[PDB]
Amino acid sequence: GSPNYDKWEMERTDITMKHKLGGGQYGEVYEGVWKKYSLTVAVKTLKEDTMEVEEFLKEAAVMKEIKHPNLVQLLGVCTREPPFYIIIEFMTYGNLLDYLRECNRQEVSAVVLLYMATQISSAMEYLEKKNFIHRDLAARNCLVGENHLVKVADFGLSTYTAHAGAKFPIKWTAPESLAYNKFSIKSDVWAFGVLLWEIATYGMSPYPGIDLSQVYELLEKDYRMERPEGCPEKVYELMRACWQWNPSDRPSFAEIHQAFETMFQESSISDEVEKELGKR
Numbered sequence: 001g002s003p004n005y006d007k008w009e010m011e012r013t014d015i016t017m018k019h020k021l022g023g024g025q026y027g028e029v030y031e032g033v034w035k036k037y038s039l040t041v042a043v044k045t046l047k048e049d050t051m052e053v054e055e056f057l058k059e060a061a062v063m064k065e066i067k068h069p070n071l072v073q074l075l076g077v078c079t080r081e082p083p084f085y086i087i088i089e090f091m092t093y094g095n096l097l098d099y100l101r102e103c104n105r106q107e108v109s110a111v112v113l114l115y116m117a118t119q120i121s122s123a124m125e126y127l128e129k130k131n132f133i134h135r136d137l138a139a140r141n142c143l144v145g146e147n148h149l150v151k152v153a154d155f156g157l158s159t160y161t162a163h164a165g166a167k168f169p170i171k172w173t174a175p176e177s178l179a180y181n182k183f184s185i186k187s188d189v190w191a192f193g194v195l196l197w198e199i200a201t202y203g204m205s206p207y208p209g210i211d212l213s214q215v216y217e218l219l220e221k222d223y224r225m226e227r228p229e230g231c232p233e234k235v236y237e238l239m240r241a242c243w244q245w246n247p248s249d250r251p252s253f254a255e256i257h258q259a260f261e262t263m264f265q266e267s268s269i270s271d272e273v274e275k276e277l278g279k280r
């Protein structure tokens with residue numbers, strides 16, 4: 001309502017800055033508090049004098065355009081001068097990889113594994129529809145909140161090893177992306193498949209006992225990860241479709257989401273009945 005108003009910009013002093021999250025594993029991401037409203041937030045920062053200004057500013061632009069229940073939601077930025085902030089709502093249970101590695105499987109049961117996958121493929125259908133490419137989909141890049149709410153994120157984490165002049169997470173990376181640097185919503189589909197396998201194993205590292213140097217060549221001979229113990233057949237079938245060698249042969253996220261939503265609804269019906277028996 002005044003000449004230098006920007007609806008996304010906040011004042012840094014609105015925000016109480018506290019500890020770095022995850023002991024550094026998320027980069028420059030800090031727990032903060034938006035004082036006026038209490039709200040605990042997460043704050044990504046870039047200090048002055050860096051060669052990352054353009055990339056950070058590009059990140060802010062993108063988030064201003066992303067609005068979905070299962071994608072991280074921008075609350076505000078500080079980008080009028082250094083240090084830059086990007087502020088989003090705090091997700092209390094941390095990243096999905098660790099959550100799966102530390103959980104109680106009585107709570108995180110098979111209906112919850114289906115819930116997680118449905119939420120993630122819904123965030124990816126949205127990106128698919130808006131013609132975005134995530135480019136680093138993985139359980140380390142999903143966040144968990146109350147009642148197994150899952151939101152997709154991207155910390156810019158690049159485990160990652162040297163490849164084609166940069167750092168790639170080989171075991172999540174689609175073949176055309178490794179071979180030709182070709183990234184698309186279809187390579188995200190390949191990665192979602194590895195994420196499904198991460199969920200199914202409660203967070204095991206992919207391609208167990210296989211050294212990264214052998215992954216591409218095995219994939220090119222049509223080797224794929226085997227079905228995890230206890231992974232339902234239909235879910236494995238979806239994994240193998242995400243891992244079609246030709247990107248065009250892989251399902252869309254719309255299709256994947258509809259599949260998971262159906263299975264989640266069926267599973268949830270069984271879950272509520274067992275619980276209703278428990279109560280009583």
Ligand SMILES: Cc1ccc(C(=O)Nc2ccc(CN3CCN(C)CC3)c(C(F)(F)F)c2)cc1C#Cc1cnc2cccnn12
Nearest residue numbers: 021042043044072086089090091094133134135152153154
């Ligand atoms: C402070 C912060 C800043 C930024 C982001 C962030 O996720 N950035 C992001 C940037 C771009 C994109 C889309 N592009 C991907 C690349 N692609 C080439 C283009 C499309 C997306 C996506 F989610 F939409 F994918 C996310 C997360 C946080 C957090 C947090 C937080 C909240 N609670 C907790 C608890 C523990 C740890 N962290 N934490």
